[PDB]
Design a protein around this ligand. Structure first.
Ligand SMILES: NC(=O)c1ccc[n+]([C@@H]2O[C@H](COP(=O)([O-])OP(=O)(O)OC[C@H]3O[C@@H](n4cnc5c(N)ncnc54)[C@H](O)[C@@H]3O)[C@@H](O)[C@H]2O)c1
Length: 355
């Protein structure tokens, strides 16, 4: 189930940062021509992919998941940490690659077809066929378009979203988070933003937690704030990874806004016990634009300026200030929606109509 079955198989290379429609189209054509296909993800320790947060391992794992139900397609990893352009290193890169073939196949006396898209690779590869019983052959592939699409996807992700393979999409998603008091225009604001650009959105986990377990704000305890941290995060993850994500998604609240309600309203010894779960979660969050509703749930209502001042205190603590936009109105914009909807334009780049 984990080594390639057939007798003649073909080989397809790539950095795969990210994998996209182009690749897949070339791969299924490649699969229908052989009995099996060996994908080879190539990477080195600070390559184009790694620089944007998709290191060789991250790419490999995502690729394994992407082909997780294709029996006759195996994903391999060719790690490149050796000599540059004037090497005997082609000698070595070769048998690194031929190691991948021997390990991920049964059935000696194979018939291998390399599908290479760079001419120097085919020239240096043909010099280094090993003396097993396999008789390798090289064919040329048009990667002019495929490498060029990957270039554009990395540059403008939300412009080529539908061609990014779904496993890689969670990494390119823009994320807008709204934070604020029980001045919960935020929930209506979050919907109105997302539904105006057909985006998905999360809901305040605290509201759902309190209703399901049936407790008011004053009755929340340390054990409950921890359940709300992971609750809200999972809700937000669920949307970022949602199949209905079109490139940006909106989060109703954060671990920070639940940590503000937790430094307030919670004994200093108790709060200090949660700080590790708080770091772990806030570190696992990635936000692009943070919208804050200024002072305009029963216990969380009354302390608006208390919460709002502490919220900025914490937001500085985590260096998120330059992603923060405050939806004020007086003394610029007509409605806080107007201010907010235009903020999304500046921070994600989607087109919006005028009245
Ligand atoms: N059938 C199934 O597949 C199935 C069924 C039940 C459970 N599960 C489990 O559920 C999981 C599904 O995915 P997951 O929840 O583990 O994903 P995950 O927790 O691995 O994803 C977290 C990543 O997404 C980003 N992220 C998440 N929330 C964010 C936010 N609010 N803002 C910015 N960035 C954010 C982070 O950068 C982080 O690296 C699987 O790991 C699986 O084990 C799967």
């Amino acid at each position: 189930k984990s080594k390639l079955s057939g007798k003649n198989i073909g080989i397809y290379f790539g950095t795969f940062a990210p994998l996209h429609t182009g690749h897949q189209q070339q791969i299924y054509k490649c699969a229908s021509l052989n009995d099996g296909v060996l994908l080879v993800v190539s990477g080195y320790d600070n390559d184009r992919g790694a620089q944007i947060g998709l290191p060789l391992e991250k790419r490999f794992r995502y690729l394994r998941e992407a082909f997780n139900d294709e029996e006759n397609i195996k994903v391999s990893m060719l790690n490149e940490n050796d000599l540059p352009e004037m090497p005997n290193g082609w000698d070595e890169w070769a048998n690194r690659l031929f190691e991948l073939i021997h390990h991920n196949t049964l059935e000696n006396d194979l018939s291998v077809t390399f599908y290479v898209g760079e001419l120097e690779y085919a020239a240096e590869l043909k010099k280094r066929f090993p003396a097993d019983g396999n008789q390798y052959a090289v064919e040329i592939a048009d990667r002019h378009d495929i490498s060029l699409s990957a270039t554009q996807i990395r540059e403008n992700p939300q412009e080529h979203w539908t061609h990014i393979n779904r496993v890689f999409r969670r990494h390119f998603s823009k994320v807008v988070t709204v934070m604020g008091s029980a001045s919960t225009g935020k929930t209506t604001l979050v919907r109105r933003l997302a539904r105006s650009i057909n985006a998905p959105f999360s809901e305040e986990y605290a509201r759902e937690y309190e209703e399901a377990f049936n407790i008011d704000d004053d009755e929340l305890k340390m054990d409950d704030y921890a359940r709300m941290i992971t609750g809200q995060y999972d809700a937000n993850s669920r949307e970022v990874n949602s199949p209905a994500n079109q490139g940006i998604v909106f989060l109703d609240t954060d671990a920070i806004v639940t940590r503000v309600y937790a430094k307030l309203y919670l004994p200093k010894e108790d709060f200090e016990q949660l700080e590790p779960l708080f770091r772990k979660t806030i570190a696992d969050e990635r936000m692009d634009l943070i919208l804050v509703i200024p002072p305009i749930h029963m216990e969380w209502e009354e302390s608006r300026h208390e919460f709002h001042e502490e919220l900025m205190r914490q937001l500085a603590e985590f260096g998120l200030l330059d992603k923060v936009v405050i939806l004020d109105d007086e003394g610029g914009y007509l409605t806080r929606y107007h201010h907010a909807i235009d903020a999304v334009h500046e921070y994600t780049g989607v087109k919006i109509e005028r009245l």
